[PDB]
Structures are given as structure tokens and as C-alpha cells.
Amino acid sequence: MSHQFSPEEQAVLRIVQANLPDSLTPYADLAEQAGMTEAQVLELLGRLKASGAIRRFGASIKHQKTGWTHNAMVAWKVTPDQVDDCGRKAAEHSHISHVYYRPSSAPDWPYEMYTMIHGRSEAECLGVVEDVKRTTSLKEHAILRSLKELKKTSMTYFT
Amino acid sequence: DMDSMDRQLLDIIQTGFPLSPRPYAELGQRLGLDEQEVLDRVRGLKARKIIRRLGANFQSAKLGFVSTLCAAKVPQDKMDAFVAEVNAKPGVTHNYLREHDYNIWFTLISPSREETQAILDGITQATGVPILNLPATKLFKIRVD
Numbered sequence: 001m002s003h004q005f006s007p008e009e010q011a012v013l014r015i016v017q018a019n020l021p022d023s024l025t026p027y028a029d030l031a032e033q034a035g036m037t038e039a040q041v042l043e044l045l046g047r048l049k050a051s052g053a054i055r056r057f058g059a060s061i062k063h064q065k066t067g068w069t070h071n072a073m074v075a076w077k078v079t080p081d082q083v084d085d086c087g088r089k090a091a092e093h094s095h096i097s098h099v100y101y102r103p104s105s106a107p108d109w110p111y112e113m114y115t116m117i118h119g120r121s122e123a124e125c126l127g128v129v130e131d132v133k134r135t136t137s138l139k140e141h142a143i144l145r146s147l148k149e150l151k152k153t154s155m156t157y158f159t
Numbered sequence: 160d161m162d163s164m165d166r167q168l169l170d171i172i173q174t175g176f177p178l179s180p181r182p183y184a185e186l187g188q189r190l191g192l193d194e195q196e197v198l199d200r201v202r203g204l205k206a207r208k209i210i211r212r213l214g215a216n217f218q219s220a221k222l223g224f225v226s227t228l229c230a231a232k233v234p235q236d237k238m239d240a241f242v243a244e245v246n247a248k249p250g251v252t253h254n255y256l257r258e259h260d261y262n263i264w265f266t267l268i269s270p271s272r273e274e275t276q277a278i279l280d281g282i283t284q285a286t287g288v289p290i291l292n293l294p295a296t297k298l299f300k301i302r303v304d
Contacts, residue, residue: 102295
């Protein structure tokens with residue numbers, strides 16, 4: 001982090017990654033804790049928001065309009081000529097949130113297209129698996145059913 | 160359960176909390192509300208857990224960080240040792256026991272592809288278990304809403 005940001009900038013960023021100080025003047029509070037001016041705080045936050053380094057500067061709210069529940073991690077066999085077509089088509093589905101292409105040179109792991117499936121009941125998730133089979137050229141797959149959540153943490157970019 | 164002013168407030172502060180010296184006064188001017196009432200309303204929504212967090216959310220790649228998905232064939236006799244070496248890494252944010260021969264699946268974030276590989280090699284060294292390092296080369300769908 002020392003290569004992109006000054007120690008003072010990193011001090012502002014260590015705080016904002018948690019919470020903005022709870023007051024009428026939070027940027028002045030940030031300025032005094034970090035050893036900067038309020039204008040310098042605003043310029044740093046404005047610069048990263050403009051560049052896309054800060055994806056969102058504001059409130060994280062409970063969901064949007066989401067209930068529950070069932071998740072399904074499914075890996076599919078794919079040839080290079082199918083990749084973009086299968087990727088874009090599988091991603092067009094409402095119940096799929098993540099579509100990744102992750103190359104594998106592992107002989108016993110031939111699955112490279114990953115679809116994260118959502119919804120309700122186990123059979124509804126298995127239904128989206130049937131929807132992908134009829135709407136794409138993807139056939140062979142492996143269902144990676146979650147048995148136990150061993151760690152669920154948030155990444156700390158500024159230590 | 161809240162009023163239309165709270166819905167309008169949350170519609171603004173989700174896209175962007177104001178980057179100005181008096182941000183609640185900036186919200187008051189936009190919403191037709193007293194500066195202090197906007198602070199009172201934000202504190203209330205935070206207390207009720209409607210607002211989870213108010214601050215920065217980073218785009219890992221723009222900060223020079225790389226991400227990967229890791230997989231291992233973990234036998235029952237090596238399970239507790241492997242799970243502990245994986246969880247002891249701060250770069251690992253998600254770890255799951257999955258229903259497959261490759262039963263341990265985890266996410267690993269670090270400043271470079273070389274550092275991530277050295278972390279994985281370090282785990283293999285301590286546990287005797289090889290790991291598949293599976294970065295994504297193409298993205299078609301991502302969840303943030």
C-alpha cells in the first residue's frame with residue numbers, strides 16, 4: 001500500500017474502510033486523526049471515487065428486496081470456442097449471480113465454467129441446472145454442495 | 160418500516176454520501192430537512208441495522224490486489240490441520256466444506272499472483288496437501304446488489 005499511498009492517506013483509508021466518524025463534520029475528524037487537512041481528505045476520497053478505486057462511498061443497507069435462501073456452486077466442462085457464448089448465455093438467467101471461467105490443467109478437475117445458482121428449495125436450484133442445459137451447449141458438470149461454512153470474513157485492504 | 164423521507168435519504172446515501180465539509184447540511188438542502196434531523200435519521204437507521212455500514216467500499220483490482228479460488232482433495236486424517244492453516248491466512252475470506260472429492264474450497268486475496276502462490280505452497284508444505292490455484296480469466300456475472 002506504501003507504493004500508492006502516503007502514510008496519512010493510508011490512515012484516512014484505514015478508518016473509512018470501517019466507518020465514517022459519527023458527526024456533522026466527519027472529514028474534519030478524519031483530517032485531525034490522520035495528520036491532513038479536511039480539503040486533502042476530500043481530495044483523496046474524491047480521487048479514488050472518480051478512478052473507481054472506491055466502488056461506493058456511502059451506506060451499506062440490509063439486502064434491497066432479498067429473502068431466502070438456497071445456494072448452488074456448479075462447475076461445467078467447456079471448450080475454448082464455447083466459453084464466451086456459454087458464459088454470456090448462462091449469465092442471462094435470473095437465478096445465477098456469478099459466472100466465472102477458471103482454466104484448469106488438473107487432470108482430475110476438468111470443470112472451468114462456474115455458475116453460482118440461487119432461489120428457494122433444492123429442486124429449484126436443480127431446475128436452473130436443467131435451464132442452463134437447455135439454453136446453452138453446457139452438458140457435463142459437478143455440483144459442489146456447501147456442507148459447512150468454515151470462514152466468512154471481509155478483506156482488510158488497509159492494515 | 161420507515162417514511163418516504165428515509166427512502167429518499169437512503170436512495171441518495173447508497174449511491175453517494177456527500178464528499179463536502181457539511182454533508183448532512185448538503186443532504187438537508189437536497190431533501191428539505193434540517194441538518195441535525197438528517198444526522199438523527201442516519202443514526203436511527205444505523206441503530207435499527209437498516210444501515211449496516213457508512214464508509215468506503217473498495218474495488219480490489221484497482222488497489223493492485225489479485226483474487227483466486229482454491230481447491231483441495233482433503234482426506235479426513237488431514238482435515239483439522241488443513242482447515243486451520245487456511246483460516247490462519249487473513250487473505251482467505253471464504254472457506255467451505257463442499258460435497259465432492261475436492262471438498263475444501265476457499266478464496267484467497269493478495270497483492271500479487273506470486274504472493275498468493277507462495278501462501279498456497281506454504282500451506283502445502285505444512286500439511287502435505289496439494290492445492291489447485293484457479294484464478295478467473297473471464298467474468299460474465301458479479302453480485303453486489
